[PDB]
Design a protein around this ligand. Structure first.
Ligand code: CA
Ligand code: CA
Ligand code: CA
Ligand code: CA
Lengths: 148, 20
């Protein structure tokens, strides 16, 4: 659905900025590729172009904010959402033990270019840590990620 | 504020672009 509040748009704009390194307002294969690799992925040039083509409404070879917004505004079916939420969990769960620790969260955010203090990360872990085991499992992950 | 969510949006975008 697309009944996005200005607050949500601004939040997506900041997410867009993690990709748009030079801040020119467009995401190129180079930028998309850089982010994916810092996350442990290894895409080919063709795969990157194919990904951009999916949402390239104006055919200019790059992804601009309006296109990224429409990508994020799209609503998908349950069997798609569950799998995608699982794929997302796998990214943070570096050692793959089924849980997300403070170190792993900090690692993904640091590679993305965000500067987090030691306290900020631990504060985040405790907000999502429902069962109180110091870590974050899938259920707690889904709640924090999809919040708002 | 909501840095975890912002970060999550980026990761989710990649998953949506990969289109399964
Ligand atoms: Ca750019
Ligand atoms: Ca475009
Ligand atoms: Ca782990
Ligand atoms: Ca927990």
């Amino acid at each position: 659905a697309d009944q996005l509040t200005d607050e949500q748009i601004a939040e997506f704009k900041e997410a867009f900025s993690l990709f748009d390194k030079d801040g020119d307002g467009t995401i190129t294969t180079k930028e998309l590729g850089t982010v994916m690799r810092s996350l442990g992925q290894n895409p080919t040039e063709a795969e990157l172009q194919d990904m951009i083509n999916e949402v390239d409404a104006d055919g200019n070879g790059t992804i601009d904010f309006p296109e990224f917004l429409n990508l994020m505004a799209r609503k998908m079916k349950d069997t798609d959402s569950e799998e995608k939420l699982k794929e997302a969990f796998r990214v943070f769960d570096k050692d793959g033990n089924g849980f997300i620790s403070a170190a792993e969260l900090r690692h993904v955010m640091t590679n993305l270019g965000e500067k987090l203090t030691d306290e900020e990360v631990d504060e985040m872990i405790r907000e999502a840590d429902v069962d109180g085991d110091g870590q974050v499992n899938y259920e707690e992950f889904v709640q924090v990620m999809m919040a708002k | 504020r909501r840095k975890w969510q912002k970060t999550g949006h980026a990761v989710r975008a990649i998953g949506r672009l990969s289109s399964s």
